Design a protein around this ligand. Sequence first.
Ligand SMILES: Cn1ncc(C(=O)N2CCC2)c1C(=O)NCCc1nc2ccccc2n1C
Ligand SMILES: [Mg+2]
Ligand SMILES: [Zn+2]
Length: 313
Amino acid sequence: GLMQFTLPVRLCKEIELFHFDIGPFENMWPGIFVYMVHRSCGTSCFELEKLCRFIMSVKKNYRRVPYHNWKHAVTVAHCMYAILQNNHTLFTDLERKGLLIACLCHDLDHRGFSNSYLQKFDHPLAALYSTSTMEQHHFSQTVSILQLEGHNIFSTLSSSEYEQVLEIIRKAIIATDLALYFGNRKQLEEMYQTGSLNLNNQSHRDRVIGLMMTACDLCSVTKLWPVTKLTANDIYAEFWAEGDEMKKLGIQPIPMMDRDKKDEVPQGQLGFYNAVAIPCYTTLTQILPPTEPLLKACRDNLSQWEKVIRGEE
Ligand SMILES: Cn1ncc(C(=O)N2CCC2)c1C(=O)NCCc1nc2ccccc2n1C
Ligand SMILES: [Mg+2]
Ligand SMILES: [Zn+2]
């Protein structure tokens, strides 16, 4: 009860910043997460014992893949932590509870393959879930782990509050399906600009939490350049393995996934910052001004990819 988590000084200060990197010491990541739940939510949100047992079962259900791994889960939760702490008064008690958990759980049991590869492989998950295949799986794994004995971190919520939090988590996890981000953001753009955006409207809150999920999920582009660049290596290690598997099914993969087209990475990064990242952080900053440092960091990394193309690195 009187048992705070505390971090060393450098981490205690830097964890508050959007560009914080959680570091290479895996054994400190659970403690970093609990620290974020305690300051974001309170020391009373969760029974420590249940929370710790939940976290460890979540870690166990992430796989040893280059990018969609336990470090990604914690990284995406830290970015959510930073958004929530810079917008103290905008979110409900249930939202603060749900969104850090959603982030920790959003890629549970990922195998390093896209929805597209599952559909072309004819994986069982693609018959069970026809759209947002992996994301419906991640939510499914979240509910499974919540139902293990001693893992119900929400046990003190009422029946209707429990239904509300599981519904926040569901929509938040589904929103990490990038295919859905394009329309969600267009709709948010029009609502903000015609001044119809209304945060008392539940369907509007949903869209804004969806955009936060995309922003947190992509947050490798908002780090200091050496973090961004070394994270890109892990991302391509998965993409190129998928490309290899596409070629095993007799299908030329898209160039993003073809290791024979490494030369095209720098131009593919510009497309991605211009088509996905910059628009994401722009609309996020319009709705939630204190998230501006994510947009600034993203623009700094786009300019670093521009230098790569010009052979200045
Ligand atoms: C940095 N980050 N964060 C997330 C993602 C991302 O896309 N996803 C889906 C799972 C997470 C990326 C990223 O790097 N995407 C790579 C973009 C890209 N590289 C190309 C190389 C050649 C041709 C086209 C290319 N495009 C579009
Ligand atoms: Mg995902
Ligand atoms: Zn993710």
